[PDB]
Design a binder for this molecule. Sequence first.
Ligand SMILES: *[C@@H]1O[C@H](CO)[C@@H](O)[C@H](O)[C@H]1NC(C)=O
Ligand SMILES: *[C@@H]1O[C@H](CO)[C@@H](O)[C@H](O)[C@H]1NC(C)=O
Ligand SMILES: *[C@@H]1O[C@H](CO)[C@@H](O)[C@H](O)[C@H]1NC(C)=O
Ligand SMILES: [Ca+2]
Ligand SMILES: [Ca+2]
Ligand SMILES: [Ca+2]
Ligand SMILES: [Ca+2]
Ligand SMILES: [Ca+2]
Length: 539
Amino acid sequence: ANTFLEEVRKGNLERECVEETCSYEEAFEALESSTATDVFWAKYTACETARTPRDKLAACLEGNCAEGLGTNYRGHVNITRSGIECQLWRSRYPHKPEINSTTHPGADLQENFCRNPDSSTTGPWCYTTDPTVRRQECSIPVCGQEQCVPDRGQQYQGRLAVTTHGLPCLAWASAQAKALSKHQDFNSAVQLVENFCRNPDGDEEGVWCYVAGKPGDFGYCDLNYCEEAVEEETSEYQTFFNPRTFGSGEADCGLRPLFEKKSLEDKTERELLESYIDGRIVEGSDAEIGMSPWQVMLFRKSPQELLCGASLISDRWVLTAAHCLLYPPWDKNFTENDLLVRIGKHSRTRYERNIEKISMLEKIYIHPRYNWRENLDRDIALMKLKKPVAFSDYIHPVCLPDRETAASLLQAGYKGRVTGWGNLKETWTANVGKGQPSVLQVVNLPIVERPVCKDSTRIRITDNMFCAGYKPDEGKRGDACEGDSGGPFVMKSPFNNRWYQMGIVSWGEGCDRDGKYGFYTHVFRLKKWIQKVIDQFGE
Ligand SMILES: *[C@@H]1O[C@H](CO)[C@@H](O)[C@H](O)[C@H]1NC(C)=O
Ligand SMILES: *[C@@H]1O[C@H](CO)[C@@H](O)[C@H](O)[C@H]1NC(C)=O
Ligand SMILES: *[C@@H]1O[C@H](CO)[C@@H](O)[C@H](O)[C@H]1NC(C)=O
Ligand SMILES: [Ca+2]
Ligand SMILES: [Ca+2]
Ligand SMILES: [Ca+2]
Ligand SMILES: [Ca+2]
Ligand SMILES: [Ca+2]
């Protein structure tokens, strides 16, 4: 920096180029030689994907942590991801290198320290003494992994320009991103710089940016968000989405046609208001007619087959889980023409031709930051139907809550509802008890404390999942594996009688050991994502 005076003083790399960002000549004054160097303007410019405090740069510049997929690295991790001894760069046993210390003399390729000369999208790596293993990535702790970007990075100032899926964020700049995506406008506190990831429209799922492909395409860039759980956080219903791309159905969701419109109460909906009382433990039962009218089935074309549950949020749009449509482990890649939704069925098999409508989908949006390789993180999917579905007493959409509203609910409700034809037991276990159920069952379950559900699992719970089910005991027993894969978990509000979907059934560890819970994907986060995916329309 150059705050007026201070140029009487001799250059300081730390004060000036490390404590503050900088320019070429400030650098020079400080430097003794005009080595505008290579991997040293890169000691700077590969370190730009870092920009937080005195340290994140010093840590980066003194090559101790990896920058993004960091060809900045110059540490001493002589080992692999598994833990194989690293082969010396200078060697040819067991593997004769293609990339010696001349091909890539920019990079610090000496001894046997993990480096990233060629830039692996897996980053810093090394040659392996395990002669069957040529190269392999190395487990380096990354820069200020201990930092925690907060508030989904509303504040975020730094400069990432590619997404999780590694695409280049187009600059907000453009004649379409600005002057043809002007249609939607933002929070003007958030400085949009070129094409660096930002969170203008206050999205709950993190930062993002427009991308190439279809107009309004986009994705969420990778950043290490703080653990901000809603569970640790109106008089009636005001509408959220634009009803030209959502379809109508919104301003009138969650009020059931054959109940909340008839001032009639359903057989276990009392249990839900009276959420505090140490209830007896009510099991599943054949639901009433038109009790969950946002219910959706997801039918595979040939052969006939019931894949998953899903839910209806409007005339057009149908919500389910990502893993339902796409799962490389079961070699699963379904597409818009393989799939049919049966909206508002009651039997598992019969064709309720007076009643249910069946539909083709006009495009299937798998969720942007969905990933299974680790652990079904962000297991979410959105589908638009080839024509608005006409409502009635059997079909009628649900309400998707903001955070503030889901926040409200969990404060007051301590139970929710899970319905389906028990497809989760069907997909994910051998289902060796009594067979699949004959009708759309219904049950109510308790929500568990975030900590309980956290230390109730070897697995890990992001601030984006949640758990349900009574905690197994000798009469306080536990069947957890309830509901449909990719289905709804709803709660009813005692402020507007409306039914919100709180979660999306995912895979439960509580499908194996008697002692676990059903895991659910919080739907409060989703709005703005949905907000962008709809807006990519007009008709
Ligand atoms: C890597 O080499 C250094 C050389 O001092 C040594 O301290 C370290 O123990 C070595 N580790 C392995 C796995 O070879
Ligand atoms: C470095 O490896 C290349 C790759 O084939 C090899 O041909 C060459 O002999 C090596 N470079 C030098 C300068 O010896
Ligand atoms: C699944 O198949 C489609 C159509 O053949 C293909 O374009 C695509 O590569 C696959 N999609 C994914 C997400 O793997
Ligand atoms: Ca200064
Ligand atoms: Ca200065
Ligand atoms: Ca200076
Ligand atoms: Ca200063
Ligand atoms: Ca100067």
